[PDB]
Amino acid sequence: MASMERFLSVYDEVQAFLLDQLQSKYEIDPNRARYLRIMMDTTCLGGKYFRGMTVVNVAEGFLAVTQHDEATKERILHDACVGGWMIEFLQAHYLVEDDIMDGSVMRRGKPCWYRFPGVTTQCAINDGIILKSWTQIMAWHYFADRPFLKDLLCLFQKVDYATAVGQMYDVTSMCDSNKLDPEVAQPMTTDFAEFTPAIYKRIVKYKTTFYTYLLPLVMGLFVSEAAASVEMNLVERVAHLIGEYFQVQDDVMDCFTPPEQLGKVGTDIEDAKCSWLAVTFLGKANAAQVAEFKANYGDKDPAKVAVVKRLYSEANLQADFAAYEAEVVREVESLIEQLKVKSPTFAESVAVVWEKTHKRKK
Amino acid sequence: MASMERFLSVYDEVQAFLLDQLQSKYEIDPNRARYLRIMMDTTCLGGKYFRGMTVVNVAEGFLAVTQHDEATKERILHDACVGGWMIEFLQAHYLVEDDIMDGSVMRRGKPCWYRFPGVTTQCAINDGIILKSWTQIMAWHYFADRPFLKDLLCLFQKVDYATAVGQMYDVTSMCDSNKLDPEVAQPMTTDFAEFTPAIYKRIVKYKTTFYTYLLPLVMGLFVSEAAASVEMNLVERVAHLIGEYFQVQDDVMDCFTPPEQLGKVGTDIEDAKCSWLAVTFLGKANAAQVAEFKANYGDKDPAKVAVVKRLYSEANLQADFAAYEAEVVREVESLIEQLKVKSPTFAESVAVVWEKTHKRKK
Numbered sequence: 018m019a020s021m022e023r024f025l026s027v028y029d030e031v032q033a034f035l036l037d038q039l040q041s042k043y044e045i046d047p048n049r050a051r052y053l054r055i056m057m058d059t060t061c062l063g064g065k066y067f068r069g070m071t072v073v074n075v076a077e078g079f080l081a082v083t084q085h086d087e088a089t090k091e092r093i094l095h096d097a098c099v100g101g102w103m104i105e106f107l108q109a110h111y112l113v114e115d116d117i118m119d120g121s122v123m124r125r126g127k128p129c130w131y132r133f134p135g136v137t138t139q140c141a142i143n144d145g146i147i148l149k150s151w152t153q154i155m156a157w158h159y160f161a162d163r164p165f166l167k168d169l170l171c172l173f174q175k176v177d178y179a180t181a182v183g184q185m186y187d188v189t190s191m192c193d194s195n196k197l198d199p200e201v202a203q204p205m206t207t208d209f210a211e212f213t214p215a216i217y218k219r220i221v222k223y224k225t226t227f228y229t230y231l232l233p234l235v236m237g238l239f240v241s242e243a244a245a246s247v248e249m250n251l252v253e254r255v256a257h258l259i260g261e262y263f264q265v266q267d268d269v270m271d272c273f274t275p276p277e278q279l280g281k282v283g284t285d286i287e288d289a290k291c292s293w294l295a296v297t298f299l300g301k302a303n304a305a306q307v308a309e310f311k312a313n314y315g316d317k318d319p320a321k322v323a324v325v326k327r328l329y330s331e332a333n334l335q336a337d338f339a340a341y342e343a344e345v346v347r348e349v350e351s352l353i354e355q356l357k358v359k360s361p362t363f364a365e366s367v368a369v370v371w372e373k374t375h376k377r378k379k
Numbered sequence: 380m381a382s383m384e385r386f387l388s389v390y391d392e393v394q395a396f397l398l399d400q401l402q403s404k405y406e407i408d409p410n411r412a413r414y415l416r417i418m419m420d421t422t423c424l425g426g427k428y429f430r431g432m433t434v435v436n437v438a439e440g441f442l443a444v445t446q447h448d449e450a451t452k453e454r455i456l457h458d459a460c461v462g463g464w465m466i467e468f469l470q471a472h473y474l475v476e477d478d479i480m481d482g483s484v485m486r487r488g489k490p491c492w493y494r495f496p497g498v499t500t501q502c503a504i505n506d507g508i509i510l511k512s513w514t515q516i517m518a519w520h521y522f523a524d525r526p527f528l529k530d531l532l533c534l535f536q537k538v539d540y541a542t543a544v545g546q547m548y549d550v551t552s553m554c555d556s557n558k559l560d561p562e563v564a565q566p567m568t569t570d571f572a573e574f575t576p577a578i579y580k581r582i583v584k585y586k587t588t589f590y591t592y593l594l595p596l597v598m599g600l601f602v603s604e605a606a607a608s609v610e611m612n613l614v615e616r617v618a619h620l621i622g623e624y625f626q627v628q629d630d631v632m633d634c635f636t637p638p639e640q641l642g643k644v645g646t647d648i649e650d651a652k653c654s655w656l657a658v659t660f661l662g663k664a665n666a667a668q669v670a671e672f673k674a675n676y677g678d679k680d681p682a683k684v685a686v687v688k689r690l691y692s693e694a695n696l697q698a699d700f701a702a703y704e705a706e707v708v709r710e711v712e713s714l715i716e717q718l719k720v721k722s723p724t725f726a727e728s729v730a731v732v733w734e735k736t737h738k739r740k741k
């Protein structure tokens with residue numbers, strides 16, 4: 018796609034700015050400059066650019082219905098691309114760290130960054146921090162004189178905080194809350210009492226939906242100066258809903274999508290994650306299916322994983338999925354219709370974000 | 380000290396604000412709220428509060444020479460305390476991550492946060508991210524209407540970036556630069572060619588001096604609205620110098636200060652760090668001392684560490700230290716004298732920052 022290529026060309030412009038500044042102001046040597054260029058490419062590139070292109074999309078919609086000079090148009094699109102990369106970089110940050118936390122092997126068809134031989138965990142932790150730090154650097158550089166600066170920084174930060182909180186809910190999702198204590202080593206849950214739709218929903222809300230949908234959508238709004246022309250509560254609701262769905266697909270794919278197609282190797286069963294599979298399964302299983310799940314979940318033994326996977330196929334979960342989706346389709350279209358009242362153009366953009374999410378195969 | 384107690388009472392006010400907001404806006408449960416309260420206390424408290432009290436100090440100086448209402452005075456001091464905690468929290472962030480990276484066991488007389496049984500590395504990585512994220516949260520809350528907001532955020536960010544860059548120079552300080560490559564596992568240096576005063580100085584400049592001295596000093600200036608009444612290049616120079624010295628002491632203590640007094644267990648020899656000890660030693664050793672250093676450095680074997688430590692004692696390094704210090708004393712006092720031209724009050728505060736650093740025993 019031509020538009021994707023234009024968004025990538027701003028990546029080259031950002032990277033070259035970031036690296037020239039390391040050299041001219043942070044006394045970097047060529048090899049450390051090289052390491053961070055490979056780090057940026059391996060961690061920030063190779064994905065779908067969903068979040069980034071979302072901001073471009075939202076901006077493009079408002080441009081098509083609003084009077085601007087040619088140069089202003091080019092500036093808005095360039096801002097949209099820069100904000101998109103802020104988000105793509107903030108995601109790169111969370112991915113680097115999350116891949117350590119989850120004990121993952123593969124990401125975007127390559128070894129997880131921390132698994133690169135010349136990286137290791139200890140460098141990758143700090144490489145992760147650099148990625149987020151790059152987001153603020155590129156913000157202050159690119160947007161210093163922009164009227165939306167304060168708004169964008171305050172939002173960005175809030176979204177970032179929420180992701181980090183969400184990551185905490187996620188990584189402690191297999192511990193009984195009552196047992197959670199920094200001083201005592203957490204034994205995994207035996208009851209699974211906390212594998213509920215309500216609790217699963219709090220996890221995903223925080224760890225996913227803010228950075229994945231809210232941020233890109235509001236960001237495209239800021240760069241167009243169009244945030245006053247929308248009902249913000251609707252934008253928030255639609256973002257959390259679509260974002261939720263996106264995570265359900267992600268959870269399904271962990272288990273049932275071949276790594277050749279996913280570009281990652283699944284670990285939720287092994288990690289004992291509070292995933293949609295586990296929660297939907299515990300929501301319909303009989304007493305003996307539950308007991309067999311309990312005897313096998315959260316263990317790296319390939320034979321126990323196999324048992325958990327066989328349990329999922331048997332429990333006919335893609336019927337629960339089809340209902341779940343049918344329901345999400347209802348509420349999303351409903352929100353889209355509600356969005357048309359103040360902002361038909363924005364509503365279109367949400368329809369396009371939803372079409373692409375709904376249709377994704379990786 | 381009474382002043383320290385007043386600064387801590389703002390910590391209780393910040394913590395209670397942070398935790399009430401987790402509950403009322405992020406749907407936290409009491410036990411996860413409890414975990415993060417212990418996390419904040421264990422990671423943010425128990426230190427010297429040097430960086431935090433520095434901002435209080437700088438503000439206190441300007442207050443003593445400037446006309447303000449009582450309420451304004453109380454607001455400035457409260458801002459100074461909030462900015463101080465931003466920095467203490469940003470340090471807590473770097474410490475949590477750094478302790479993972481360095482394979483450290485003890486910090487402030489307690490197991491390193493990641494070594495708490497109910498923590499582990501994977502939670503501590505994300506606990507670290509939360510700590511930094513808390514800094515921006517408390518900034519936007521406490522300072523939303525303050526004229527210095529943009530200035531403080533832009534500085535903060537720059538200082539944060541520099542720390543992360545510095546951490547990269549530090550953690551890759553035992554690799555030959557030419558060999559550095561994400562795809563190939565780094566073999567430690569055999570030549571030590573890069574253990575130079577110049578290179579050691581670039582490391583410390585970035586990883587230490589910005590967050591440790593520049594940030595607290597400029598921050599106290601911002602909260603007093605007094606940044607126009609100083610020569611900024613002098614503040615920068617004094618900060619990098621004192622900051623450097625501070626890191627030299629830190630490096631000396633790693634090796635020669637009993638963990639009972641340090642509150643940490645040293646790892647630089649084992650980690651093969653480009654420390655002042657190693658660099659000063661390579662700067663004076665004879666051919667056979669160098670060879671014995673090469674055969675023993677960067678290895679966890681207690682007997683090889685012993686050999687490196689014996690080499691340090693023999694090479695009479697506390698003579699090099701005494702010269703190094705005598706020199707730093709010259710240049711610091713020189714800068715202090717230069718600072719008196721525009722800002723005698725600020726110059727006093729720097730003298731007090733220096734006296735306390737110079738005199739520290741942990």
Ligand SMILES: O=P(O)(O)C(O)(C[n+]1cccc(F)c1)P(=O)(O)O
Nearest residue numbers: 111112115119180184187224225267
């Ligand atoms: O399947 P992955 O590992 O790509 C994941 O979606 C990443 N991820 C998602 C949300 C927040 C985050 F920091 C990271 P998950 O949550 O680990 O399943």
Ligand SMILES: O=P(O)(O)C(O)(C[n+]1cccc(F)c1)P(=O)(O)O
Nearest residue numbers: 473474477481542546549586587629
């Ligand atoms: O002796 P430590 O481990 O307290 C140290 O001073 C921490 N520290 C210092 C500077 C930056 C940083 F992120 C962390 P060092 O550098 O590991 O020696």
Ligand SMILES: C=C(C)CCOP(=O)(O)OP(=O)(O)O
Nearest residue numbers: 064065066067225229264267
């Ligand atoms: C489910 C989430 C939020 C993490 C994976 O994100 P994506 O699947 O969008 O990642 P890339 O295409 O960017 O790899």
Ligand SMILES: C=C(C)CCOP(=O)(O)OP(=O)(O)O
Nearest residue numbers: 426427428429587591626629
């Ligand atoms: C040398 C540096 C910068 C890290 C240790 O910092 P401090 O020795 O000031 O840490 P605390 O008193 O805050 O533990």
Ligand SMILES: [Mg+2]
Nearest residue numbers: 115116119121
């Ligand atoms: Mg993951």
Ligand SMILES: [Mg+2]
Nearest residue numbers: 115118119187
């Ligand atoms: Mg994860």
Ligand SMILES: [Mg+2]
Nearest residue numbers: 267268271285
């Ligand atoms: Mg997943």
Ligand SMILES: [Mg+2]
Nearest residue numbers: 477478481483
């Ligand atoms: Mg350390």
Ligand SMILES: [Mg+2]
Nearest residue numbers: 477480481549
């Ligand atoms: Mg260190």
Ligand SMILES: [Mg+2]
Nearest residue numbers: 629630633647
């Ligand atoms: Mg040290």
